[PDB]
Amino acid sequence: ADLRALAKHLYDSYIKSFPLTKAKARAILTGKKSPFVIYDMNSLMMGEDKEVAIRIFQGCQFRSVEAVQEITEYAKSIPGFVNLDLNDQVTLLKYGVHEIIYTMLASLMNKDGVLISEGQGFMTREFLKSLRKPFGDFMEPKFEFAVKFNALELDDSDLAIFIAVIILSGDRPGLLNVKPIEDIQDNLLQALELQLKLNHPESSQLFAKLLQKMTDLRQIVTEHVQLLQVIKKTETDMSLHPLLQEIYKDL
């Protein structure tokens, strides 16, 4: 009742904050316009009106920057978020933002590719895997995570709660007030359990599998940060986006 209003509240805010949702993405991928398919260097050149490894990586950065802004706007709508200490608000975003991006990137993906440029394109998994030395390894773990995660079959309303659970992790480094975060998160976890019991009544053990994926995201995010440092050792004066530099600065 108070837990359904919380679900309904989070769904509305998720729709206000995130312009490309799992429902919008899946409507495009299922076969109902039509995105340009980029499967090689030729098709890429063809669909440029909608160094490549580096040009694609910069797109990954730019879209990751916009996602941080969307996640920050969404976080503010989480009941209690704004009244937590401001340093704790920073920490929660700084540590949880890459887990959410990973979760939400799964929403645009299948085993063959990813929806790009607001749904106008579709870059193949084989074309990204085909990129030079470090850049070729960038997407593959995201694809492997999406395949196992998309099989859970969550929609936008389920995901709205899960994203809120992730932001409100009381175990992030340097938090000043653990208890208020854990308390909001218990309410959010309850809400999540009830949403999955009603939205997937046939799907027993879904909240369980979802909590395991939540634990997995931590390991999955460190591996992505490890990969980003490999880029900095190989590539020169290029650098990361001020905001990304700021999130990645001293983790």
Partner: peptide, 16 residues
């Protein structure tokens, strides 16, 4: 946090 200028501004004022 002073060491997170953009994050702080996004939280305090939103995206410009």
């Amino acid at each position: 946090t002073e060491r997170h200028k953009i994050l702080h501004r996004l939280l305090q004022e939103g995206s410009p």
